[PDB]
């Protein structure tokens, strides 16, 4: 259900999400880019159709960045991904916590198929901080 860009950027920071792997902390870097396209434009009604008929029928064009290592706050290493979506389908998300919740599934079932992980459910929204690493 992710559609796989390639993308140089950087993009704009957005938010940052924290999760597990088997192995350790990841952190998901949701930024986003006008460069990149935007999904098929449809109302929530549309959208709630196809994920009926097809559990990963609505398809998300997003970059899913190279692993970059970084420290979490008790000093370990873990991983960070960077991930963009479409800019205005990042103000869509903003104001939905259902479709952010569902680009982030998508994220990080993205990452999981092509960084061969699997990641937690439990996910949390950090706070303080938009992203994880550098920029």
Same mark, same amino acid.
């Given at each position: 259900?992710?559609? &796989?860009?390639?993308?140089? *950027?950087? !993009? ?7 999760? $597990? /792997? ?47 290592? &970084?420290?979490?706050?008790? *000093?370990? !290493? ?7 979506? $479409? /800019? ?48």
């Amino acid at each position: 259900a992710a559609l &796989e860009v390639l993308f140089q *950027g950087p !993009g704009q920071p957005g938010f940052c999400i924290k999760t $597990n /792997s088997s192995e350790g902390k990841v952190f998901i870097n949701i930024c986003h880019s006008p460069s990149i396209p935007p999904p098929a434009d449809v109302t929530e009604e549309e959208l709630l159709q196809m994920l009926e008929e097809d559990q990963a029928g609505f398809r998300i064009p997003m970059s899913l960045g190279e692993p970059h290592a &970084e420290l979490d706050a008790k *000093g370990q !290493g873990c991983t960070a991904y960077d991930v963009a979506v $479409n /800019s205005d389908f990042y103000r869509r998300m903003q104001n939905s916590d259902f479709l952010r919740y569902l680009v982030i599934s998508i994220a990080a079932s993205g990452l999981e198929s092509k960084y061969r992980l699997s990641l937690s459910p439990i996910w949390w929204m950090m706070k303080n901080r938009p992203f994880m690493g550098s920029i």
